[model samples]
Target: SISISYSTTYSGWTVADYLADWSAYFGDVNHRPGQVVDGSNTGGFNPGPFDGSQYALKSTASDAAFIAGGDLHYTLFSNPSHTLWGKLDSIALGDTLTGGASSGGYALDSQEVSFSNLGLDSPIAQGRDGTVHKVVYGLMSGDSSALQGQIDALLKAVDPSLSINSTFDQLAAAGVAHATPAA
Candidate 1:
C-alpha cells in the first residue's frame, strides 16, 4: 500500500522550483508511471510543456500525473467555471502549502477526507471526467492502510457496491448518485 497526504499549511513550493525538482526526480522522459502532474497556469507563473492547456513540467512529462509530497495550487469555485482545478507545483511530501504567490499560496490545511468525500476516486483526472469540482493541494504517503481505509470508507459511503479494488473510471461511472454538490 502507498500512503499519500496533502496539506495547505505544511507543504508548498514554486512553479519553477517544483518543475525543476520533479523533472530531475522523475527523470527527463516521455512518461512517468506512478506519478501525478499538474499544468494549471494562472496569475503570472508562465510555464510550458505537453499538449493543449496541459503543460509538461519537463520536456518529457505531461500535466496529468501528481507526485507524492509535491505542492499544488488548489481553487474552489462556487459556479462551475473553466480551469478551476489545482495548479501543480513541486514540494516535499507532507511539507505545507505556503510559499507566497508563485509557490502555491497562503497557509491552509486540506485533508484527504476533503477529497474522498466527493465520492469519486484518487487521481480523479486520469480516466474519469465527473463534473464534481474540488481540488487538493499536496500529497505524501506515510501509512498505506490509513489511506486505503479512508478510500474504502469513502467508497462505502458513495455506493456500497463499490470496493477498494474498483478503478477510478468505475468510480466516476458510479458517481451519478454521489453528484449532489462539491467544491
Candidate 2:
C-alpha cells in the first residue's frame, strides 16, 4: 500500500510559513487541504471551535478512488496544549514504482493520539507551546490477523475509527491496491 508521511518544521518561520511549506510538499493539486494552504491563525493550534477549516490528508484508488495509509507529524513552535486529529477521506492503490501494490487493501494503526510537552504539564515535562517542540506522527502496516488486531486496539484508544478493516475499505474505495499481503 501507499504510505504518506508529513512533518512540520519551525526554525526561522512563523506558523503561517510552516503551513505554507508543508502545503508545497503535496503533489495533488486537485485535492489540497484548505487549512494547510490557508492560515489557521486562531491564536491556538486546535483552531478552537473549528473542525472543517483545516486541511486533511486524502487519497484515491485507480479502480476505486482514494489514497492509502499515511502519517502526519507536527512540530510546534509554541507550547500550547493541542490535539492531533486525522480521518480517512479516501484510499486507493499503491504505486508499484514506490514499492506499493495494485490491490486496494490497507489498514490504519492509529489516529488523533494526544501528545503533550513534558515541560508544559503532566507526568513528563519537555517543552511548551511557545517553546520549540518536535512531535513525530507515524503509521505502520499491521502484521497478521493477530498483530493487526493488536495495532487496531491501540489506535482505537486514540481514535475509535482506526480499525484495520475500516482503513482497508477506505483504501480500497480510494483505488489503492495491496502491495504486500501475507499469504
Candidate 3:
C-alpha cells in the first residue's frame, strides 16, 4: 500500500532551494532545512524520546557535549568547543556551479570522532592555520625506531598547531614506544 500525503506536499520548491536550506542549516544558523529536520515544524514526530517537536541535535547529539563527556554513554576524549550538532562552522565557497537551476551543494562541516587503539602520541587528524592534514592512526598507534624521528618531522612538517608534540611520558602511558633521536 502506497501511502500518500498530498496535503503535505508544497509547491515553489526547487532542488537548489532544498540544497541551500541544507547548506545553511549547518552552521549558518539562519535557515531551516525542512520540516523533518531541526525544529521548524510544530507537529512532526519520527525521532525518539518524546517527539520530533524538539531538536535532538542540540540535546544529546551536541558534539561538544559528547566529546567533552556530558552524556553518560559518551566518554570524555577532548575539550569542548562551540560545535553545533557536530558542525564546526560554515565554509562558504564564495561561488557555485549548480547544474541547471536545480543544483547547488553544501556540507555541514564537522570535527570527526573515531575509535582506535591510538597511543597518546598519535596525530590522528589535524587542522592548521590555513590547511588540514592527517597522520595514519596506525602510524603511531604502535611505534618504530626507524620512523620515530620521521613521524615527528612529518607531524611538524607543515604546522605546529596540529602537530603531535607528545612527550615520552605520554607515549609510554599509551603503550606506544619512543626512541630518543640518535643523540
Q: Number of backbone collisions per candidate, in order?
A: 22, 41, 0
TM-scores for all candidates: the values are: 0.27, 0.18, 0.16
What is each predicted model's overall lDDT from 0 to 1?
0.29, 0.25, 0.22
lDDT of 1: 0.29
lDDT (Cα, tens digit) per residue for candidate 1, span 78-135: 2322222333222222112233334433222212111322232233343112221122
Q: For this target, which candidate reaches the highest TM-score against the unseen true structure?
A: 1
Which stretches of model 1 miss by more than 4 angstroms? 1-141, 176-183
* Model 3 pairs whose backbones collide: none
> Per-residue lDDT tens digits of candidate 3, residues 62-169?
221001111111112332211112111111111111121122211113321111222222121322111110121111112122223333444344334322344333
Model 3 scores a TM of 0.16
| lDDT, candidate 3, at 104 | 26
